[PDB]
Amino acid sequence: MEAIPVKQFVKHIGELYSNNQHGFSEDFEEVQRCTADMNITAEHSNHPENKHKNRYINILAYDHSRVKLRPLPGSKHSDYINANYVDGYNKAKAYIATQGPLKSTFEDFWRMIWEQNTGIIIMITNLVEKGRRKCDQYWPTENTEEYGNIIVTLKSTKIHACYTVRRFSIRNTKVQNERVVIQYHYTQWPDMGVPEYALPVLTFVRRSSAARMPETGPVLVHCSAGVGRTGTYIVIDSMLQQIKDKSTVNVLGFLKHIRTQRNYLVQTEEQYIFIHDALLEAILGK
Numbered sequence: 001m002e003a004i005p006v007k008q009f010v011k012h013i014g015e016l017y018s019n020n021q022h023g024f025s026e027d028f029e030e031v032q033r034c035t036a037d038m039n040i041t042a043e044h045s046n047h048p049e050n051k052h053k054n055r056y057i058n059i060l061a062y063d064h065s066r067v068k069l070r071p072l073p074g075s076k077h078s079d080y081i082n083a084n085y086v087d088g089y090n091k092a093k094a095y096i097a098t099q100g101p102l103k104s105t106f107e108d109f110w111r112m113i114w115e116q117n118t119g120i121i122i123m124i125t126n127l128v129e130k131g132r133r134k135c136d137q138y139w140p141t142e143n144t145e146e147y148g149n150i151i152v153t154l155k156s157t158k159i160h161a162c163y164t165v166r167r168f169s170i171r172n173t174k175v176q177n178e179r180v181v182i183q184y185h186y187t188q189w190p191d192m193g194v195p196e197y198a199l200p201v202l203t204f205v206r207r208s209s210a211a212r213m214p215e216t217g218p219v220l221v222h223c224s225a226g227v228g229r230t231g232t233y234i235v236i237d238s239m240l241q242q243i244k245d246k247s248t249v250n251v252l253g254f255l256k257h258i259r260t261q262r263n264y265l266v267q268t269e270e271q272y273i274f275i276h277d278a279l280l281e282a283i284l285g286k
């Protein structure tokens, strides 16, 4: 569970894939239980005033790492958002891992972006997938929309084969004060089966990560629950940064660490194997 050299990592992937992928299963079972005895509380998440603010009853925001909204003129639970700070490579609180916002949380979502000085949104979901509602549209289709004291204008849209880039101009009405928020939206979701090819995800991760300018707030990352694909993106991004910097990889170690920050980050064994596949392709992209 120490940083493994890229060469050894490649050999370690082989060990994990053998014997009907049992090594991957053991690794993922180890991730699933790592915080079981830590008694990590999520009191604010379970408070009755905040229940309608959670997309899934069981997908909570740990107290110690939750993003707190700056108190709002009045309420006692106006500080709550189902969002957590998550570390990145050599950068504590490099991300805000959050659920896909609800119509009832659009204002909180945009206020958090404003208050956190977030300049990048990573959306790793379609609004609807396999006929199920995954996320609500928190942005205007065209032109301007107001979300509480936050005025949001769509400035531009650039559609690529696997992802869309939307630039927004945001401004707080009741208060620099006019800012650019760039949304990187991954759109390629296989209607049957599972991904498939890591190359488009690798390009999405690299281009969305390179867009992080100094000295801005954390990059907001969301999918539906804000755990599965969110954690997947966070592990890939951090690991590509470790590979470039030190030519080492620590998937298990870094994942077990981020599991203390938000529950269920990298939610399935499939996502866990996907990280390894994506990282192998990046290492090979030489």
Ligand SMILES: CNCCNCC(=O)Nc1cccc(C#Cc2ccc(C(=O)O)c(SCc3ccc(Cl)c(Cl)c3)c2)c1
Pocket: 021, 124, 186, 194, 195, 196, 201, 204, 205, 228, 229, 232, 233, 234, 236, 269, 270, 271, 273, 274, 277
């Ligand atoms: C005993 N059970 C295992 C046996 N079968 C072996 C097996 O599954 N291999 C295997 C081998 C290689 C990859 C996979 C996978 C996967 C997968 C499934 C569902 C989802 C999903 O959409 O949730 C995703 S997310 C992908 C993504 C998209 C965009 C971005 Cl931006 C990001 Cl970051 C991440 C990934 C599975």
